[model samples]
Target: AVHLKMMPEFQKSSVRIKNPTRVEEIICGLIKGGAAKLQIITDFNMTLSRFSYNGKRCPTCHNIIDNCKLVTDECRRKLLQLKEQYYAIEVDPVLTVEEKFPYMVEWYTKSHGLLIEQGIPKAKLKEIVADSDVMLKEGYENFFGKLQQHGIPVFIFSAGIGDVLEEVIRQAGVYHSNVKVVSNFMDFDENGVLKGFKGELIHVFNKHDGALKNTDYFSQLKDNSNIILLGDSQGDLRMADGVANVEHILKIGYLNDRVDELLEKYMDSYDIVLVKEESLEVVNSILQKTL
Candidate 1:
């Protein structure tokens, strides 16, 4: 039976599906393919991690570093001061916070440049992550462990700081060999000191650049054609552009905020839209049937 509704997990109020019959058809294909052809491509920050806990917002991978003790309060002051540049694109930017989406990459670039001046040591990353308040979504063990146990390919396609992201998963005890991450990794100096980010800057808007660059990685996974893309951003839709032979994809979007305004768009974009959801039970439920 391919009915997601039959599963108790889907009965939750958080779950929203526009086309139930269509989703059932997709899951049927997923079951037919089984573990051999299955792969997972997910966003890190809010998709895998909690969006909020006890009415407080949880930090992203970058937020872990941005708020760490290693980064001086002065740096924090400088980082937020750039919000003053919200007027012009180059001078430059903040659109009443609502339209703050534009020029975000530019802001991220400047923040990294400012971070390089702090001489932050690489050794403190694990400790930094440990001291921070980052939380992965509930039921993560079953979601990650089951996939790893079944030899499924897991690709973390994110725009967050890759180093911090790695440590978060590593500390969680689920950074398995089958998991591959592509994000903005820090380029440390010979002394293990932070210098800058390596290669191209991966911001929200330019994820396609990273996706297409992973051609070599995807090229080898021709046999693994079924993909499950998990993300919290609209930009995450293109994360699987490099995969050549995709037989089926189940896009699960975590709508963490602005529910009334964004719900329609999310329902249109993702196969399944989970509003303010902080658990992987819905995802784990599908894996239970398929794997």
Candidate 2:
């Protein structure tokens, strides 16, 4: 028997499992399969990165650029206004996910439009990320290093800016070859000034579309079936929808906000829901056991 109770990390108050028996069985499968069949699919913002640090809210990939010195205060104010207006629609309980789709698209479009007008230089991104207050979740080195060492595949699927997200991880020194990031990349001119985003817009509500488009990526990793998926939003649940052959999979959700309203849904959807947690200790603990 896989004894989850024997693991001290499972005893933490932040850990919430809808079905202990099912989770234990999945863990048993993960253990038996070991590193060979395992891969990780996770969100970038608020999943791998910390939602808050030192009691202050940390910036998302877009926020890193939006809040940086390169952008003017007027531009920042307009960006903040857009964030306030669209973000409410994003998390509103009464709005169905489908209903929020167009609004999300509009939000991303307007935000990106404003960003392009700023003419942010590509060369400045490294310096901006280096000086930014971004912080990954605690124990990130182990979370990333362990998987890299074991030759495990990690796919980071996010709605955030890809270039900024890549820089954040690169600066952390954990953007390993085993990891792949898919997000909205910037389109830079020959002069290295940001003009627009390169590909399809992946906002909070369109992850399902993005996942389906990534079939080629999943197809390449057909042998690595078992998955450990991590995310912070309801939209993230669909991240693994394109996995080729999922023999066993565990979905871990971080309930970072609106805890009271969303806990029940998260507990029902995610195999393991970490409420108000800022560390990857629980997941890392499982990796310690399985890897």
Candidate 3:
């Protein structure tokens, strides 16, 4: 049949596919085009990073700040409350995407406002990330290293805080020249204290706005028609819409949580779904062949 099935990583239990034949064709197209025409558009949170490590769940960029020493226990309590309420609505199967949009907005708005109220100093962000439990998925070094070495443009589009996301990548030592980051960046005061967030507000469920609305980065890479888009949420499927002319795109979705509810949707939308997968081995395997 297809060469992909012959690959060792594809035989793993966590890998799931709705249409193996369709995937075979797409992957074939990618390998034929190779890294020269390839670019990556990936979500930051659970896409590039880990969902859970052992018994402990890894923190998102937002959670990195929420669980930090700078924020009070009271603010953390309120944040948890916001999550329980709004995030409940987020995962509710009955609600439509339209109706569910405002729920996420309110959740992030109220939560981000709380962080703003806390007067979080910009200086503390580094130590906060260092002290936090935000682990990048395993084989991240190989995934990123191959891309960097091959000179592939990796567009990291995230709804997470840009500052913390940057720190995570920089600390991981993969924030290379070709990586482009776009998210809600922190606007700090002259005294190096956070005043407000700059640019447009990016949150879950609004990736279309974040992706196509970005500057001419995608347009510049128009020649790079083959794309491997990675994400872990329902909203992440459209993360690569900005690419003008896509020759071949493989949407790899990580089913980190709520597998039963989200599995059907992900399998339909994403070309490849990694269910509860903790590493980028499946992706790295493909990259090995192409790049």
Candidate 4:
């Protein structure tokens, strides 16, 4: 076991669980469970990726599409306008999560519809991702590497474009066999032009639906009940709710923005809240000890 005193990563105030004893107990279960009982289910956006770097906000999955050359400047302007308006509701304290759910769907769908209308060729995605400024969170090498080394299953439940997300990891050389991506995949026509998305639409609010829908992956890994779920939003809290048997779960939240306003709420919902933390060292430490 990695003692809290020995770990600078865990010593940070960002790591907060409801009960320190509960966390220790869960960690002990995880350590005992080892690789066989472990599975990682995480949100792919700002949770695993850098929220900001050197005061510049890094790109999310949707941002990669919005800021890419595939879309028109006029369309980009409209998307930014939508972002400015809906993003406020997303983090607004007054609005409940239910009230914000429809807005998130509208925001994501409208952006996706615009992308489809732009007739973005599927072939251009590789180059676009290559040229973009998207970055994974710090210490990602250890995060993904350890999981891969242990042959632990990682389910990347993302609302982002699956193709782009996959390309990013593939380029990063971490798209291992143990990693499975579940996201809104682009459906292209015979001519290789983007048409629409595949399967049920997975927005930020509808992750519960996505989880229940993915019975195959979860059911097959039935024995792997110990979960370390990571996310940045309240909707993400539901990512692991569909697991059949959850022996031990450590819910970690990344409070990347509006920390002052949402810190208390995040601390309440997440087992360990990482405030303004741009690295995965804390989680990596746990993984190092567990795996």
Candidate 5:
């Protein structure tokens, strides 16, 4: 029998499992698959990245630009206002996922428009990310390096800015060749100033559509059927929908906020839920065993 309870990482107080037997079964499948069939589908913001550092919340990709020097103080205030208004709606327990979709699009669209008005120079993005409060989860090096070393495919699906996300990882020196990032990339003009975003806008709730659009990517990795999905929001659970064939999938959720209201739901949807946890130690330990 697969005994996940015996694993030292599983013993951590922050790790909560609604069904240990099922998680163990999934882990067994992952171990059986080894590096050959393993692939990672995770959200960039608050999943791979840290939700908070030293009691202060870390910035998302858009927040990196929103809080940067390039944007005017007036613009930053307005961005925060938008965040305050839409973020409440985002986590509203009254609204269903379908009910929250359009609001997310509106939030992303208005925020992106504000960003364009700032005329941020593309060349300065690296500096902005480096100086910003953005931080990857602890143990990120092991999580990323091990996967890269094993030649496992990592698909980072995010609603955040793709350009900034890539820069964050690239600057960390973990943006290996095996990593594939799909997010809203910045479209620069002839002089490299941010004109707008490229491709369809991907927001927090519409990942199901985004997943379907990336079938070509999933189809290419037909042999990598086992998946380990990580996300902070309920929307992240759908990230693996496009996988051509999923023999086994283990969903790990990080309940960063609204713990009281959303804990039960997240526990039900995800195989393992980490509450108020800041590190990737649990995930890294699983990787050590599986890879």
Candidate 6:
């Protein structure tokens, strides 16, 4: 068993797991269960992926599509306007999450609906993702490697564009058989033009609904009862809602923005809270001991 009191990584002032004893217990359960009974349920944008590279904030999956070669300057302007309007509601601290759901749906529909009208060419996606400054979190090699090395299931449940998310991982050379992606995929019509999106639209603030809808995926892995969920949003707490059974889950949240405002809430929600942490060394260390 790994002694939580002795782990050097946890000694850092930035590392904040709500209850160290609870985390140790959960990590102990994980170690006892071994790799077969483990699985990953993580967010794509700014979770597994980096929130920033250098001093500039990196774009999410949708941002890649919005600012790509396929989108004309005029279209880019429209997309920016959309962000200006809906992004406010997304981050409005005064509004309750229930009150913000419909607005979020409207925002996704309008944004995606506008893109479909442009008839995005499927062939341009590879070039778009390659050119974008999107980057995965640091220590990702060990993060994905440990899971793959043990044949553990790693489910990337994302609210971002599935194509770009896949491309990012594929380019990183971490797209392994143990990985399965669940997100909104592009629907290409005849002539390989984007007509619309397939499946239910998953947006930030509504992952609970998406998770429950993915019962089929969770049900298949019923025996994989332990979960290590990672995310950077308030909605990310619900990412493991569909798990058939959970013996223990250690929720880790990466608080990249508004630390002064959201730190307390994040600490309450997540077992571990990483504030402005640019690397995954703490998580990697825990995994090193657990796996």
State TM-scores per candidate. 0.93, 0.98, 0.97, 0.97, 0.98, 0.95
Q: Report the C-alpha lDDT of model 6 over 150-249, residue by residue, as the tens digit.
A: 8888889898889889988898899999999989899999899999999888888778888898898899999999899998888888999989999989
Model 4 lDDT per residue over 170-217, tens place: 989899999999999999999999999999889888899999988888
Better of 1 and 5 by TM-score: 5
Best-first order by lDDT: 2, 5, 4, 3, 6, 1
Lowest summed lDDT window (length 10), candidate 3: 1-10
Q: Is 2 or 4 the stronger prediction by TM-score?
A: 2
lDDT of 1 by residue, 31-127 (tens): 8999998999999989999989989989888778778898899997886576446324421122233254467767887888888998878999989
Candidate 1, 167: how far from true, in Å?
A: 0.6
Candidate 6 residue 65 C-alpha distance from true site, Å: 0.9
TM-score of 4: 0.97
Candidates 1 and 3, the one with greater lDDT: 3
Q: Give the TM-score of candidate 2.
A: 0.98
Pairs that clash in candidate 1: 85-92, 85-93, 86-93, 86-94
RMSD of each: 3.5, 0.9, 1.2, 1.3, 0.9, 1.5
lDDT of all predictions? 0.85, 0.94, 0.88, 0.89, 0.93, 0.86
Q: Which lDDT tens digits does candidate 2 get at residues 151-245? A: 99999999999999999999999999999999999999999999999878899977988998999999999999899999999999999989999
Model 5 clash tally? 0
Where is model 6 poorest over a 10-residue stretch in terms of lDDT?
282-291
What lDDT score is found at residue 194 in candidate 2? 95
Residue pairs in steric clash, candidate 3? none
lDDT of 1: 0.85
Q: After TM-score superposition, what is the CA distance of residue 52 in candidate 2 from its true location, in Å? A: 0.8
Clashing pairs in 6: none
lDDT of 4 at 163: 93
User: How big is the positional error of residue 109 in model 2, measured in Å on the Cα after superposition?
Assistant: 0.8
